[PDB]
RNA sequence: GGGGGGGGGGG
DNA sequence: TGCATCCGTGCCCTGAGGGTAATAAGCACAC
DNA sequence: GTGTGCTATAATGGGAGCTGGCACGGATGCA
């Protein structure tokens, strides 16, 4: 029964689709292709999109069962759309209704195609295990990647399917692979540099007999490398550590048990804070209202922002001249203060 | 630990033996203004270094993450009054 | 960063709550990144695993149904049935909320049909589109499993 | 036919065409009707007896099946095979679920109730229970179905720069991750109208995501991060147990204003 | 029906 | 009623250790 | 620098079973 067990589960499923004989394969592709062509056919006679017949068409061989939006498709695609494209393209003359009937077959060829495809799927997918990814997602990349095989596939050349669909399997798995196996993304042009960084790392140690400096390694890659970029580049190629692993060989203390928390302020530094913020406002009062009122309009203490000259003399109705010789002499003020009193300097940090 | 500059651990029999004595007030600044009550924490040393006496204590930042990862699990969680109207623990911050 | 935009155009208490039109980023305490949440929008309902596997299964109790059948059909090994459709299953019609396995799901759905390959120079002995009964034998080497029409699918001579 | 304009077979003059040697025989449990005139239904329809399957209402259909239009043979086929209405999984249970009306399973069970026979009786009132408790609480049983998964706040699973340049993750964000690959690549492969088994892995693969990220280890093997046997850390696992959050930072913490020294 | 376990010291 | 399987529990605080781990082609346009 | 496409011998069901030293209570199937 596999209760659990995933793996098991997909492999009996996907063993009982029958495995195709070439020709069955062979009318299978010029089924689809002939679909296709009957779907251009439509298009132009009907002067619609094709996405749209082509949806039309796979979700009446589906059946009631998928329905939703296309990325693709402009309109919303709800019943009563299909249903009125359904109705549309039945009221065609005879001659025509021929093309709806192959596109009809075409596309459960191309259903049972995609089905038939899977184990080779299985088959490459099975050698990319240990690389960040577990099988039955390499399994699901290599299925879309085979699905756009099925797309993309051209009987004519008398080649086999699984030729073509090879190709097209790795590289989803690939790009898979690349794009999502590290928990912080680095770009597969990278990723490829790192590869390759490692390989010629491990072919130097493998001829030098220990692991090489920077500068070997660099010298190894060929132009555009130095010691520093190899070095930039095992900078960036490392992962993250998790909190919850035991640091000792506990299995109660763990990782995140000393790290420290440096954005809230401390208890200490938000009480200085507040000191510094009434000692200010202190200082302050012993100026005018309008001299403190100007210097508070400047530095932010009042609506946080800084204002400049001239919005403070417009505020105050005077000269710029005269709102710069009035905040000069606050400032005057407030150093004598300082100077006097002592009770800024040891805010100075 | 003594490397981090860290501090005693009041465990689960210390507040037994608080309950036991009945030291009310005793244990609710051991849970709340001696530890993860930020606000609590910062009006105590702001009035202790000012001479006052320290302010009342607040709701734990423990309990909020309690209750955060309750709503993760996708249970509701409601703090209600004697009327069983909802009184926020947030003061708004996580209410649209 | 407290009341901060990403983008560095809000970053003082002057705007609070306004949101920033070029990161989309609401200037408010950084405190709040300790309590809002966030969304996944599933495209297929998951059952919440609390009320599935703590004996007794609340879902199963609720819906009489017991623990490996609730397993089965949660985990993709067997199918429900939400309305019969007049459908009927080995002379016994179906009922509502009965168990089918994938077998039967499918010759109740699509119908039962086999394929036959015949050994290469071996000519068939019934004629395309013929109806056949059960047991009748469609080629020397060849003996059929079900009463139905047989049809022929890549005849190698004309 | 041929791929090339050469090998094709063209007939010399008037005569009849024969088939013979095929490769393989299909049997199909179907009904056959040949056609004329233009045909109404399509390949891939369903049809009811009584219904019209071609020449403009003269042949119709005397059983339940699916239409199969052979435009070689002209010949419109019913595979004998209904519309029967069944589901998988979670969408099927809730849907069950929303049919559910309380108050008649309430008087079901109490009639149930008066049953002379222990087991049945005890087994009544385990249901009745949780039916009452459904009621009275104001709660909907399709709500224990997720349609919309939340998403903890950053902080309380904090990606930190640590003091010697490295990065310190927790493993909610992997959970999540996973949760999130699993859900695109289901929208993806959905719009693609892939066959109906990569959905139902994907939606399999998707349920146990939700699975690992509510509780992990509950069923099946623990997820487990690259190349390590140490499980993730799921939500359940930090709400219970000796270091779970209730003992280690509600019933007990660490205080300050407190020293420690020999005696 | 098919894979277990947190090291050593102090009190 | 008597067996069989799965899940849940198993003392408290403090110190020092010190943690990072076996890889499949790339190249061409585009902005 | 980063995101995306594509390429044509033929290839068509993984990982091997890293195995066994806690023990008792309870709760439900299953006789
Ligand atoms: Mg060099
Ligand atoms: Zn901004």
Redesign the pocket.
Known sequence: ?????P??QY??????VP??TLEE?VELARKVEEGMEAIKKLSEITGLDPDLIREVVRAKILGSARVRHIPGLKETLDPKTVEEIDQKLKSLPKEHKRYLHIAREGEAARQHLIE?????????????????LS?LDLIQEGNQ?LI?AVE?????????????????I???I??A?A?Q?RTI??????V?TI??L??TA?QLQQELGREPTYEEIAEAMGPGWDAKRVEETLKIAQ?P??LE?????????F?GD?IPDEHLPSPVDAATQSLLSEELEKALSKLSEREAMVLKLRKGLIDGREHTLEEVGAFFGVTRERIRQIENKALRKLKYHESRTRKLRDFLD | ????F?????????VWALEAYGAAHTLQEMLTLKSDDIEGRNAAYEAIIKGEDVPEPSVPESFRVLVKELQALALDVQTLDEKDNPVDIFEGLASK | KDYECACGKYKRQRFEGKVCERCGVEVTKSIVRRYRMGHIELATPAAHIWFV?????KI??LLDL???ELEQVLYFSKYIVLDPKGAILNGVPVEKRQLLTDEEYRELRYGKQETYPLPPGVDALVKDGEEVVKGQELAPGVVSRLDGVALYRFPRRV | AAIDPEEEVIAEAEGVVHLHEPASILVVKARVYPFEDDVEVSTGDRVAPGDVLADGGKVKSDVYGRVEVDLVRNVVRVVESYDIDARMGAEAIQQLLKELDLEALEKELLEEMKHPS??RR??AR?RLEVVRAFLDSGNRPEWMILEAVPVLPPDLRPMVQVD?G?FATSDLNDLYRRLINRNNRLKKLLAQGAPEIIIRNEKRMLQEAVDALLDNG??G?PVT??????PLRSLTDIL???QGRF?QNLL?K?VDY?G?SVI
């Open positions: 029964i596999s209760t659990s067990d793996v098991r492999l009996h499923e996907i063993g009982q495995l195709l394969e038939a495809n899977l184990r080779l799927v299985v088959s490459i997918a099975k050698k990319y295990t240990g690389r960040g099988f990647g756009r993309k596939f051209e009987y004519k050349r008398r080649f086999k399917f699984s030729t073509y669909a090879t190709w097209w790795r590289q989803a690939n790009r692979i794009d196996a993304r680095i770009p597969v042009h990278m490829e590869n390759k490692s390989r491990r992962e550590v998790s692993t035991p640091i000792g060989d506990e299995k109660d203390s990782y000393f | 630990g003594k490397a981090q860290g501090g005693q651990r009041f465990g689960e029999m210390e | 596997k703590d004996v007794p299964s199963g109790t017991s623990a490996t | 222990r087991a005890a087994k385990k010697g490295r509950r069923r093997a991060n690259p190349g390590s046997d140490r219970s147990g000796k003992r007990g660490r407190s420690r």
